[PDB]
Every structure is written in structure tokens, then in C-alpha cells.
Ligand binder design. Structure first.
Ligand SMILES: *[C@@H]1O[C@H](CO)[C@@H](O[C@@H]2O[C@H](CO)[C@@H](O[C@@H]3O[C@H](CO[C@H]4O[C@H](CO[C@H]5O[C@H](CO)[C@@H](O)[C@H](O)[C@@H]5O[C@H]5O[C@H](CO)[C@@H](O)[C@H](O)[C@@H]5O)[C@@H](O)[C@H](O[C@H]5O[C@H](CO)[C@@H](O)[C@H](O)[C@@H]5O[C@H]5O[C@H](CO)[C@@H](O)[C@H](O)[C@@H]5O)[C@@H]4O)[C@@H](O)[C@H](O[C@H]4O[C@H](CO)[C@@H](O)[C@H](O)[C@@H]4O[C@H]4O[C@H](CO)[C@@H](O)[C@H](O)[C@@H]4O[C@H]4O[C@H](CO)[C@@H](O)[C@H](O)[C@@H]4O)[C@@H]3O)[C@H](O)[C@H]2NC(C)=O)[C@H](O)[C@H]1NC(C)=O
Ligand SMILES: *[C@@H]1O[C@H](CO)[C@@H](O[C@@H]2O[C@H](CO)[C@@H](O[C@@H]3O[C@H](CO[C@H]4O[C@H](CO)[C@@H](O)[C@H](O[C@H]5O[C@H](CO)[C@@H](O)[C@H](O)[C@@H]5O)[C@@H]4O)[C@@H](O)[C@H](O[C@H]4O[C@H](CO)[C@@H](O)[C@H](O)[C@@H]4O)[C@@H]3O)[C@H](O)[C@H]2NC(C)=O)[C@H](O)[C@H]1NC(C)=O
Ligand SMILES: CCCCCCCC/C=C\CCCCCCCC(=O)O[C@@H](COC(=O)CCCCCCCCCCCCCCC)COP(=O)([O-])OCC[N+](C)(C)C
Ligand SMILES: CCCCCCCC/C=C\CCCCCCCC(=O)O[C@@H](COC(=O)CCCCCCCCCCCCCCC)COP(=O)([O-])OCC[N+](C)(C)C
Ligand SMILES: CCCCCCCC/C=C\CCCCCCCC(=O)O[C@@H](COC(=O)CCCCCCCCCCCCCCC)COP(=O)([O-])OCC[N+](C)(C)C
Ligand SMILES: CCCCCCCC/C=C\CCCCCCCC(=O)O[C@@H](COC(=O)CCCCCCCCCCCCCCC)COP(=O)([O-])OCC[N+](C)(C)C
Ligand SMILES: CCCCCCCC/C=C\CCCCCCCC(=O)O[C@@H](COC(=O)CCCCCCCCCCCCCCC)COP(=O)([O-])OCC[N+](C)(C)C
Ligand SMILES: CCCCCCCC/C=C\CCCCCCCC(=O)O[C@@H](COC(=O)CCCCCCCCCCCCCCC)COP(=O)([O-])OCC[N+](C)(C)C
Lengths: 52, 62, 218, 139, 176, 148, 49, 109
């Protein structure tokens, strides 16, 4: 019984380790893509002098 | 199947229309300026505080 | 003009009373009116006619919350029983508006949907984890905290229950039922021979009847 | 109350008599048509004539004072009693066994509830810095 | 309408600003302020026309308050949900506690953001999209933690070892 | 406030029906044009001419015409949004007597009910004045529930 | 002890909640606008001279 | 003062043993308390973006402190539950934490 318990435990460990990288890629790529829209939303270079 | 209905306002000279419904209605209410009477077709759903008289005879709302 | 024609175009801020129907909120359509008339002059002394059948929307700034679907203006003659010669005239301009619902979809409906999804995940969590009640109670607490957002964003009218309000109440009842049923499950999971005896109907149902439709050691 | 422009040599002020022909020193309140404030009780409501200091080379005024006591029942229900209950629950964590594994889950959640009541009072207390309210001391 | 001119005779087609006496708004920086004189055809063809002067203020927000008091705490709190992948899958590992209480804190941030965002429906604000994103991510990780805890606590008395899942375990071990 | 009883006399409007006069002793509401308030329904609309002898005869406050509005709250918003969830959360504390002492984290659920009840108190505190005439009925239930 | 506390606490809370809520459920405005005045002050009960 | 009280509770999780199973309860719920108190701070302090105030810096320091404590507590819990069979003990960890930590030796074994 203990050996089969350890088998289930090891399976859970491997699945958890895989889904960590999957979730990390999701979080990082999503945050970067959302805030790069903020990074590229600059005031356009209009053909006018500055206001001051 | 047709029906003859009154459709004048208040105490104006009487006028007549042709209702396709099976009833004509009289609607009476009072605001600050006086009494309004509305005549027409059917039996509409009125707000609370309004007197309504529906009837199934021709030329029956006055 | 030399003819004697006067044109007067004053501005105004019109704050008008409108029966608001919240039945289908935030997907509601409203029809709001502006009744205009000569206050002290009746139709026998001053006659008012609409300039056009419709209000002028040529210089209408775009609304970020409503779309005007229809607009028209109607003149009404009102006669009273005591006075058959003097009409009372009014011009009522109505506007049928449709709300743009994206704001309430994003800020109310989606978190409620997420909480509704999170409600059912406690039934795949085993009892031996010691985390069933933590999950359920925290989902309930998240909804309770979200009630602050919902109260601050959704109007406080009692004419009808909003559709968004029905969704919120359904979700909250859902999580409460989940907590009750999870308590029943946990009470079942710790039943022991020392304190309980298995009824024959429980064995006849859950150990042989139901399981034949599913898979486990039995 | 004072004359904005005229000084004492032109307009002289005195405390104004009630319908009773006696030297009053009080704000008049009609006892039949006055509905008392639900938050405040008027203890003293006097009236005085303040003359200014003598000039070697401020104008006189009539001051009406209202000494008003707050009626704290709302704060007794919404703040004080939940704080008392939370304090009893903070007492009773020490009677929990260590083997139950629930001491943090009780005491720190009591702290969380206390933060919720801090949010409750955040929009009620005065914002001045001359002293600290006793209810904030208690919280 | 004509525009005024400066000492050099150049036409001032902008909002004038006393640069010595100007104090910037604490949240808004002015980048451009062009001025334009517009002429339009009259309300009746052939009749008198209409004219107006338009000044456009191109104003850029300084986002420091939202960065300091909203965005950075929300990002750091939403990053804690990835730490549930390193807690043990057993009683006392607290796997679900972290993942669901991060969502509770994120709901508190929803209350924080609902007081500041505009209430228009032409578009979704960037902060709104980020909050919805991190909440969806946290929900998925609560689901994945639930699944992992289900897999790890299968007692052998009532649960049969799937041979194909052990086979895919032995497939994934050398791949990595 | 410009004239007293000796200068003007206040009375209700006299209207006629069928040649018989009556005083209009009510607020007039046009039934066709009236839109009800969203949370208040009008039950009574009386009108009175009040003369109080306590104030002196030379006071403008001797005579008045008072139009009263007795209005019942429509409780639907508060029942749906606040009251039903508060009652249902407060009644879930009885579930802790079914939870075992081993996996049933009794006290965490028990204190979380208290936390939710404090959130509801926070919601209530912004919607009512801080008067001392009475404790609100929802406030009474909330205090009773927190004590329990 | 848990079962005894179940059988004690729950009826107390049920009774307290019912008692609290039957005050509001049975709270109605009076049928007359002025206690002591039998007049209803309605249009239909208009008082002729 | 509430920020100070929440800050002092942050390190106390490192006095909580792992076998209690309540280390992450403490840390995460202190974080929840900070997050709820953020509503109080936003309701009380000015909302200006010209510069970061000292209160803003203290709030951010407290929050980053709590996040760091959570991360390091997860590392500690992971180290506590390392299986002897799957995870062999490296010699450098043994040298740096069983041999070169001879400072306070009320410990044993
Ligand atoms: C949202 O909301 C809004 C509100 O706010 C809304 O709105 C709405 O809308 C609607 C529509 O849709 C509308 O309706 C409409 O209206 C209109 C108006 O009305 C008004 O006026 C009228 C007229 O008057 C006149 O006449 C008469 C007779 O006839 C008389 O009596 C009077 O006195 C006057 O007289 C004057 O003037 C004239 C000219 O004009 C001259 O000649 C003389 O001499 C003098 O000076 C009237 O009638 C009306 O009244 C009525 O109504 C009221 C209320 O309103 C009441 O109170 C009254 O009583 C009445 O009643 C009666 O009638 C009714 C109907 O009308 C009924 O129902 C009842 O029951 C009774 O019986 C006033 O004041 C009108 O006009 C219209 O009507 C139409 O229709 C109907 C049906 O529906 C019929 O019946 C009629 O006949 C008519 O028909 C016509 O038209 C149509 C169109 O419109 C067509 O289709 C047809 O076919 C016909 O046609 C024909 O004829 C015409 C004329 O002649 C011609 O032109 C053509 O060509 C052909 O031949 C209606 O009704 C309303 O109003 C409104 N409202 C407000 C604004 O307020 C909305 O809708 C909403 N939305 C949603 C929901 O979506
Ligand atoms: C809604 O809110 C309104 C107020 O905004 C309520 O209206 C009030 O209703 C009550 C009860 O119906 C009224 O009290 C009654 O007043 C009459 C008239 O007396 C008044 O006017 C007299 C001159 O016309 C004046 O002399 C009176 O002053 C004497 O009496 C009072 C009261 O005893 C006393 O304080 C004075 O010192 C004077 O001695 C007075 O101003 C009065 O006849 C009624 O007597 C009844 O009650 C007494 C016992 O109190 C009893 O002995 C009598 O036999 C009788 O039964 C009664 O005092 C009040 O005036 C109204 N307020 C107004 C008009 O603004 C309304 O009821 C509310 N509706 C609800 C809650 O449904
Ligand atoms: C549930 C308790 C409701 C008590 C409040 C109440 O008076 O009933 C509410 C029920 O309105 C609802 O339908 C409740 C909200 C949606 C369902 C939530 C539970 C699932 C409103 O009552 P009503 O206005 O008479 O309802 C009209 C009919 N309707 C319920 C179909 C809309
Ligand atoms: C929603 C969350 C709950 C899912 C419920 C699944 C139900 C189910 O059919 O169980 C499956 C479990 O299958 C496994 O054992 C693997 C489960 C998924 C593993 C991969 C997760 C990937 C990471 C995260 C992304 C199949 O079970 P079964 O082998 O058919 O045994 C009988 C199950 N029955 C009684 C439910 C029929
Ligand atoms: C910071 C300072 C704290 C002050 C609290 C204090 O003085 O104790 C309070 C008790 O303690 C309570 O909180 C009373 C319990 C809640 C009130 C409910 C009953 C209403 C009392 C009334 C019905 C004092 O409350 P008390 O003993 O009722 O005396 C107050 C005087 N009173 C009768 C005018 C209300
Ligand atoms: C269920 C309850 C109602 C659902 C259906 C509502 C009906 C409806 O109009 O659908 C609308 C639901 O709008 C959407 O596109 C979904 C919500 C926005 C996406 C999530 C925001 C953050 C995503 C971050 C993670 C579709 O209308 P639309 O105008 O096509 O949508 C707006 C377009 N936009 C989404 C590109 C901005
Ligand atoms: C982060 C900065 C600290 C990184 C510490 C890395 C060493 C500790 C570590 O790996 O332990 C855990 C992450 O322990 C964690 O704390 C991982 C956190 C990663 C996500 C953080 C999101 C915020 C994972 O341990 P492991 O991978 O099972 O250990 C294998 C052996 N090794 C430690 C040599 C790899
Ligand atoms: C603040 C909370 C943290 C305190 C830390 C104290 C020092 C410590 O690490 O633990 C010590 C607690 O000292 C004891 O061995 C006695 C513990 C108290 C017993 C009686 C309590 C009475 C409380 C009032 C009635 C023991 O430490 P250590 O076992 O010698 O291990 C070395 C730890 N070091 C390297 C950090 C020194």
C-alpha cells in the first residue's frame, strides 16, 4: 500500500512540476503583452512645437 | 367582424371610428387643471387612480 | 428681421424625469422624454408647432455609455371637460436609448462567472487534503468582498430585480449550497464503525448501483 | 453676530430680549415645533454680549453658544460591541489545543476583521491632528 | 477670428503658457497645444457661414500613483499563485490556501480599481484587462492545484493505477 | 414670512363637482403622468390648515398649510442584495456542529462567518444616518448574529 | 457536546431571526394619516359643505 | 502604526515550525490584512502622482517584505519536506547547515 501511495505521490510531483513551467510562461507572457501596449502608447510626434 | 367606437376628447363634439376589437373604452382622470376623458378601442391597461369603463356594444363609450 | 421674424436659440441643461426599467440591466433599453409647453399660455393664445418631426442630432457628441436608437417629437392637444374651446398644447420629444453593456460585463459579470466556476472545484478536492472548507469558505468570502463592488456599481432601485442582480443572487445561493453539501460530504467521510453503522440503502446505492455507471475499486 | 461696517461709536449691540419681557441670555427654542437632532442633544444654549478690548490709540459682537452632546448609540453598535467580541475571541485562542492546528486561523482572522472595522471608521472620525479620538485609541 | 501675433510678427497658433509662472498638474503633463481657426458653411446654402477657434490640449498622464499603489502590489500578489507548485501535495501543505486567498486579495483590488476607472463601455481599460487576466490565471492554478491534490492522494484501496498514465510518466521523465 | 394672520388668511383650494364645493384636502397627483419613485411608494397625501395658538398673534408662523407625504420603502433592493445573503451566511454557522474535529476546520469557518458579517456591517454603515433614536432592524439582526 | 450545542444553538437563532424579522414584515403605515382623525383624506371621500 | 504591526508579524512565520502546518496561513492572511488596509490608506492619503510619498514608500516596503517572506517561507517548507529517496542531500548543504552553523548549539543530533 505504501509503495503504491508513493507512486501516486511521484505522479503528482511530476505533473505539478510541468504545470509550474506552463503557468509561469502564461503569467509572464500575458503580463508582458498587456503592459507592452502601455509601453508603446506614446504621445504621437505631431508636426507642432511643444506646448512649453 | 367590426365595431363602431367613439374617440372624442372630454366634451368635444362627438366623433366616431371603426374599432376592429370587440370593445370600446372610456378613460377618465383628473389632474390639477381639470378632468380628461379619453375614448377609444379595446380595453387598455390603465395606471392606478384612473377610472376605466369598457363595454362591448357599438357607440357605448358615451 | 425686418419682417418681424424672431429666432431665439438659447442653450439649456434639461434634467428630465424618466421611468427607468431595470429588468434587463445591463442590457436594458430606455425610452426617455422631454415634454415642453407654454406654462401660462394655452393653445388659444399661443400655438406651438414642432420645427421637424425629429430632434436635431447633427451636433450630437458621441455618448460612451448609450446609443440613441430612435428619436421623434409628437405634438399633443389636450382638452378638458370644463373648457371645450381652449386646447392645451405640448410637444414631447422622446429618445429610445440602448446601453452599451461592456463596462458591467467586464467589472461584474466575469468575476461572478469565475466564482461560479470556482464553486464546483471543491468536489474534485479530496477530504484528506484538509482544504475543502478553506476553498469553499474563501470562495464565499471573495463573493462577500465583491458585494462591495456590486453595491457601488449597480443602481439601488427597487422597481425590479436587475438581471445582473439575479445572477449575483444565484451565484451566492450556489456557493452557500456548495458549503452545506461539502459539510455533508465531510461528515460522511469520517463516519466510523465505532460511532456509526452503514445502512443497507447506502450500500445498495453508492457501493454497487451508482458505481456501475462509473469506475473505481468499488 | 456683529455689524460688519459700523463700529461701537455708531451702532451699539445688546442681547435681544425674548417675547418674555426680561433680560434674556439664551437662544430661544420653540418647544412644540423643534425636532431635536438625532445625533446631538442641546445641553446649554446661552447668549452673551462681547465688548472688545480698550484701544491704546475687533468690534463688539453678540455670541450665541451651543454646547451639544453627541449621542453615541450608533458607534456602540457598529464599532464597540464587535471589538469586544473580537477581543473575547482573541482571549480564547489560548484555550485552543496546539494539536488542532487552528490558532493562526483564528487570531489572524480576528486581526483581519479588525482591519475591516478600521475601514468602517475611516470615513467617520475627524481628520485633525491636535489629539487622537478615544475610539481610535481603543481600536 | 484671427490669431494674435508676437513681437516678431509670427502668428501665435497655440495656447500661450507663461513658462516662468506655470505649475504643472500633479497628474497631467501638456505635450502639445495647437490652435486652429475653422470656417464652416452656413445652416442654409447661400446664407451666412459660421466660424470658431479650436484649441486641442494633448495631455499625457503621469501613472506613478497607479504604478505604486495598484499595479506593483497586484503583480506581486498575483505572482504568489505560482508558489503553490512548490508546496507539498498532502494535508498541511496549504496548496489551496495560497491560491484561493490570492484571489480574495485580487477581489479587494477589484474594489480598489472600481473607484478610479471610468464608467464608459467603448473599450476595456488596460488595468481592467490585467485584473481579469490575473484572476483567470489564478482560477486556472486553483483548478490545477485541485487536480494535483486529487492525483497525489489516491489511496490504493479504492483507486486503481492507470497503466497508460504511468506510461506517459515514463515518457515525460527522459524528455526533460 | 412677509405677512401675518392679520394681513393674509391661508386656506385650502375649493373645487367643485356637480355644483357642490369641496376643499381640496390632498396633494394632487396626475394619475396618467405620474411616475412612481424607484424605492418609495406613497400611501397617504393629506393636506391641512394649521393654526397654533402658542406662537404670538404677530408671528408669521401662526398659520401654515401643510402637505404631508407618508411613504413606504419598497424593500426589494435591500432584500435581494443585502438581507438574504446576510441571513444565509449567518445561518451557515450552524454547519460547524456537523463538521468533524479532525478535517473539519471548525473555527476557521466560524471566524469567516464573522468576517463576512463585518463586511455586511461595513456595507450598512454608509447607507443610514448615525442617529440614536433606535437600532436598525438589520442592525439588530447583525448584532445578534455576531454575538451568536 | 457538539450535538447538544447543535440542538441548543440552532433553535435559538431561528427564533431570534423570526422575532426580529416579524417586526419589519408586520410594520405597516396606519390606515389613517393622523392617529385620532377618522378622515382618510382621499379624493373619493371628499367633504362637501 | 497598523503598517508597523503588520510588518512585525511578517518575520514571525520564521519562528513557526513547519510541522504545525499553519506557516502559510499566517503569512497569507497577514498579506490579506495588508491588502484590506490598502483600502484604508487609499481612503485616507492623497492620491497624487507627482512624487512618491514617504507613506507610499513605507507601504511598498511592507508589501515587498510580506511577499519576500512568503517566497522564502515556501522555500523553507519545500526544504522541510524533501524526500530522502528522491532528493539526496548534497554535501555542500550539509557542510554549510550542519557543520559551519556552530554558533547557538542548544540544538543536538
Ligand atoms: C417612447 O415614449 C414616447 C412617449 O414619451 C412614445 O411616443 C408616442 O409615439 C406614438 C407613435 O408611436 C404617438 O402616437 C401618435 O401621436 C399622434 C399625436 O397625437 C396627438 O395629436 C392627435 C391629433 O390631434 C388633432 O386631431 C384630433 C382629431 O384627429 C383632434 O381631436 C385634436 O384636437 C387635434 O386637432 C387639431 O389639430 C389638427 C391637425 O393635427 C387640426 O386639423 C384640428 O383642426 C385641430 O387644430 C390627437 O388625436 C391625439 O390625441 C389622442 O391621443 C392622446 C394621447 O396621446 C389622448 O389623450 C387623446 O384622447 C387621443 O386619444 C385618441 O386617439 C388615440 C390615437 O391617436 C387613440 O389611441 C385613443 O384611444 C383615442 O381614440 C394627440 O393629442 C397621433 O396623431 C397618432 O395617431 C395616428 O395613429 C393612431 C393609431 O395609433 C390613429 O388612430 C390615428 O388616426 C393616427 O393615424 C394616422 O397617422 C399614422 C401615423 O402617425 C398613420 O399610420 C395612419 O395611417 C394615419 O395616417 C392618416 O392620418 C394622418 C393624419 O391626418 C395623415 O397625415 C396621413 O396621411 C393619413 O391620412 C399617434 O397616436 C404618441 O403620441 C407618442 N407619445 C408621446 C410623444 O407622448 C414612443 O412611441 C415610445 N417609444 C417606444 C416605446 O419605442
Ligand atoms: C405625520 O406627521 C404629522 C406631523 O408632522 C402628524 O400630525 C400630527 O398628528 C397628531 C395626532 O393626530 C396631532 O396631535 C393632535 O392635535 C390636535 C389639535 O391640537 C393642536 O392644535 C390646537 C389648535 O388648533 C392647539 O390648541 C393644540 O395645542 C394643545 O394641545 C397639544 C397636544 O395635547 C398640547 O401640547 C398643547 O400644549 C396644547 O394644549 C395643538 O397644537 C389635538 O386636538 C389632538 O388631541 C388628541 O390627543 C390628545 C392627547 O395628546 C387627546 O387628549 C385628545 O382627545 C385627542 O385625541 C392631538 O393633540 C398633531 O397636531 C399633528 N401635527 C400636525 C398637525 O402637524 C401625523 O399624525 C403623522 N402621521 C402618521 C405618523 O401616521
Ligand atoms: C430567492 C428569494 C427572493 C426573495 C425576494 C422576493 O421578493 O422575490 C424576488 C424573486 O426574484 C428572484 O427570482 C430571485 C433572484 C433570482 C434567483 C436566485 C435564487 C436561485 C422578487 O419577487 P417578485 O418581484 O414577485 O418576482 C417576480 C417574478 N420573478 C421571480 C420570476 C422575477
Ligand atoms: C474540472 C476538474 C475536475 C475534472 C474531473 C474529471 C472526471 C473524470 O472523468 O476523471 C478522469 C480522471 O483522469 C485522470 O486521472 C487525469 C485527470 C487530468 C490529468 C491532467 C491534468 C493536467 C493539468 C491541469 C490542467 C477519468 O477517470 P476514470 O479513469 O474514467 O475513472 C472513473 C472516473 N469517474 C467515476 C468520474 C467516471
Ligand atoms: C471607546 C470607549 C468605549 C465606550 C463603551 C462604553 O462606555 O460601554 C458601553 C457598554 O458597552 C457596549 O458596547 C454596550 C453594548 C452595545 C449597545 C447595545 C445596547 C444599547 C444600550 C442602551 C439601550 C456603555 O453603554 P451602556 O452601559 O448602555 O451606557 C450608555 C448609556 N445609555 C444608556 C444612554 C446608552
Ligand atoms: C455572460 C454574460 C454576458 C455575455 C454576453 C454579452 C453580450 C455581448 O454583447 O457580448 C459582448 C461581450 O464582450 C466581450 O467581448 C466579452 C467581455 C470582454 C472581454 C474580457 C475583458 C478582459 C479580458 C482580459 C483577460 C460582445 O460585444 P463586443 O462589443 O463584440 O465585445 C467588445 C469587444 N472587445 C472585447 C474587443 C472589447
Ligand atoms: C524565486 C527566487 C528564489 C528561488 C530559489 C531557488 C532554489 C530553491 C528551489 O528551487 O526550491 C523550490 C522552489 O523554491 C522557490 O521558492 C521557487 C519560487 C519560484 C517562483 C517564484 C514566484 C514569485 C523547488 O525545489 P526543487 O526544484 O524541487 O529542487 C530541486 C533541486 N534544486 C534545488 C537544486 C533545483
Ligand atoms: C520573539 C520570538 C523568537 C525568540 C527567539 C529566541 C531565541 C531562539 O531562537 O529560540 C530560543 C528559545 O529559548 C529557549 O530555549 C526557551 C524558550 C522559552 C521557554 C519559556 C517561555 C516563557 C515565555 C514567557 C513566560 C532557543 O534557541 P536554540 O534552541 O538555542 O537554537 C539557537 C537559535 N539561534 C541561533 C537563533 C540563537
Amino acid at each position: 500500500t505504501g509503495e503504491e501511495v508513493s507512486d501516486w505521490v511521484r505522479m503528482g510531483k511530476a505533473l505539478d512540476s510541468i504545470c509550474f513551467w506552463a503557468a509561469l510562461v502564461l503569467f509572464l507572457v500575458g503580463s508582458s503583452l498587456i503592459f507592452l501596449g502601455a509601453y508603446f502608447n506614446r504621445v504621437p510626434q505631431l508636426p507642432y512645437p511643444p506646448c512649453m | 367582424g367590426s365595431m363602431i367606437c367613439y374617440n372624442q376628447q372630454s366634451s368635444q363634439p362627438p366623433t366616431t371610428k371603426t374599432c376592429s376589437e370587440t370593445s370600446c373604452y372610456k378613460k377618465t382622470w383628473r389632474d390639477h387643471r381639470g378632468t380628461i376623458i379619453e375614448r377609444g378601442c379595446g380595453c387598455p391597461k390603465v395606471k392606478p387612480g384612473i377610472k376605466l369603463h369598457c363595454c362591448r356594444t357599438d357607440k357605448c363609450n358615451n | 428681421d425686418y419682417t418681424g421674424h424672431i429666432t431665439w436659440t438659447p442653450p439649456a441643461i434639461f434634467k428630465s424625469y424618466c421611468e427607468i426599467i431595470v429588468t434587463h440591466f445591463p442590457f436594458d433599453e430606455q425610452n426617455c422624454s422631454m415634454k415642453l409647453g407654454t406654462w401660462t399660455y394655452d393653445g388659444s393664445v399661443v400655438v406651438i408647432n414642432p420645427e421637424s418631426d425629429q430632434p436635431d442630432l447633427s451636433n450630437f457628441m458621441e455618448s460612451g455609455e448609450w446609443v440613441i436608437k430612435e428619436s421623434r417629437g409628437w405634438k399633443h392637444w389636450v382638452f378638458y371637460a370644463c373648457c371645450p374651446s381652449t386646447p392645451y398644447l405640448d410637444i414631447t420629444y422622446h429618445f429610445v436609448m440602448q446601453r452599451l453593456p461592456l463596462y458591467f460585463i467586464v467589472n461584474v459579470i466575469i468575476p461572478c462567472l469565475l466564482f461560479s466556476f470556482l464553486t464546483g472545484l471543491v468536489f474534485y478536492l479530496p477530504t484528506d487534503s484538509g482544504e475543502k472548507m478553506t476553498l469553499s469558505i474563501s470562495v464565499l468570502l471573495s463573493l462577500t468582498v465583491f458585494l462591495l463592488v456590486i453595491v457601488e456599481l449597480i443602481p439601488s432601485t427597487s422597481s425590479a430585480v436587475p438581471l445582473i442582480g439575479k445572477y449575483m443572487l444565484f451565484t451566492m445561493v450556489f456557493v452557500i449550497a456548495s458549503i452545506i453539501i461539502t459539510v455533508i460530504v465531510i461528515n460522511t467521510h469520517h463516519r466510523s464503525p465505532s460511532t456509526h453503522v452503514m445502512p443497507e440503502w447506502v450500500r445498495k446505492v453508492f457501493i454497487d448501483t451508482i458505481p456501475n455507471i462509473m469506475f473505481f475499486s468499488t | 453676530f456683529s455689524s460688519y461696517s459700523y463700529d461701537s461709536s455708531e451702532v451699539s449691540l445688546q442681547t435681544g430680549l425674548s417675547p418674555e419681557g426680561q433680560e434674556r441670555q439664551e437662544v430661544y427654542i420653540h418647544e412644540g415645533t423643534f425636532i431635536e437632532n438625532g445625533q446631538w442633544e442641546i445641553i446649554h444654549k446661552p447668549s452673551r454680549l462681547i465688548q472688545p478690548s480698550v484701544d491704546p490709540r475687533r468690534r463688539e459682537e453678540v455670541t450665541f453658544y451651543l454646547i451639544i452632546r453627541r449621542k453615541p448609540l450608533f458607534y456602540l453598535v457598529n464599532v464597540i460591541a464587535p471589538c469586544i467580541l473580537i477581543t473575547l475571541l482573541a482571549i480564547f485562542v489560548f484555550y485552543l489545543p496546539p494539536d488542532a492546528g487552528e490558532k493562526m486561523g483564528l487570531s489572524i482572522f480576528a486581526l483581519l476583521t479588525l482591519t475591516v472595522f478600521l475601514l468602517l471608521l475611516a470615513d467617520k472620525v475627524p481628520e485633525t491632528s491636535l489629539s487622537v479620538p478615544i475610539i481610535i485609541k481603543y481600536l | 477670428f484671427v490669431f494674435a501675433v508676437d513681437d516678431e510678427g509670427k502668428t501665435i497658433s497655440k495656447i500661450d503658457i507663461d513658462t516662468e509662472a506655470y505649475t504643472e498638474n500633479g497628474e497631467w503633463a501638456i505635450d502639445f497645444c495647437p490652435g486652429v481657426i475653422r470656417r464652416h458653411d452656413g445652416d442654409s446654402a447661400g446664407g451666412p457661414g459660421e466660424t470658431d477657434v479650436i484649441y486641442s490640449l494633448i495631455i499625457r498622464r503621469k501613472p506613478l500613483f497607479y504604478v505604486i499603489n495598484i499595479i506593483v502590489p497586484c503583480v506581486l500578489i498575483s505572482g504568489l499563485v505560482l508558489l503553490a507548485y512548490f508546496l507539498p501535495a498532502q494535508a498541511g501543505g496549504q496548496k489551496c490556501t495560497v491560491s484561493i486567498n490570492v484571489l480574495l486579495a485580487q477581489t479587494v483590488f477589484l474594489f480598489l480599481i472600481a473607484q478610479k476607472t471610468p464608467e464608459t463601455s467603448l473599450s476595456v481599460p488596460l488595468l481592467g484587462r490585467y485584473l481579469i487576466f490575473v484572476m483567470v490565471v489564478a482560477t486556472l492554478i486553483v483548478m490545477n492545484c485541485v487536480i494535483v491534490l486529487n492525483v497525489s492522494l489516491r489511496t490504493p484501496t479504492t483507486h486503481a493505477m492507470s497503466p497508460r498514465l504511468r506510461y506517459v510518466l515514463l515518457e515525460l521523465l527522459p524528455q526533460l | 414670512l412677509k405677512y401675518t394672520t392679520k394681513e393674509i388668511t391661508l386656506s385650502l383650494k375649493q373645487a367643485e363637482e356637480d355644483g357642490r364645493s369641496y376643499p381640496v384636502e390632498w396633494i394632487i397627483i396626475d394619475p396618467e403622468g405620474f411616475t412612481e419613485n424607484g424605492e418609495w411608494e406613497i400611501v397617504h397625501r393629506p393636506a391641512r390648515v394649521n393654526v397654533d395658538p402658542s406662537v404670538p398673534l404677530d408671528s408669521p408662523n401662526r398659520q401654515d398649510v401643510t402637505f404631508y407625504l407618508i411613504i413606504r420603502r419598497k424593500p426589494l433592493f435591500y432584500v435581494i442584495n443585502i438581507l438574504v445573503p446576510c441571513v444565509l451566511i449567518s445561518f451557515m454557522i450552524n454547519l460547524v456542529f456537523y463538521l468533524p474535529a479532525d478535517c473539519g476546520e471548525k473555527t476557521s469557518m466560524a471566524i469567516s462567518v464573522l468576517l463576512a458579517q463585518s463586511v455586511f456591517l461595513l456595507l450598512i454603515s454608509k447607507r443610514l444616518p448615525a442617529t440614536s433614536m433606535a437600532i436598525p432592524l438589520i442592525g439588530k439582526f447583525l448584532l445578534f448574529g455576531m454575538v451568536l | 457536546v457538539d450535538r447538544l450545542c447543535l440542538f441548543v444553538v440552532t433553535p435559538i437563532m431561528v427564533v431570534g431571526t423570526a422575532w426580529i424579522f416579524l417586526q419589519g414584515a408586520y410594520n405597516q403605515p396606519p390606515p389613517q394619516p393622523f392617529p385620532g382623525d377618522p378622515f382618510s383624506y382621499l379624493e373619493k371621500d371628499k367633504r362637501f359643505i
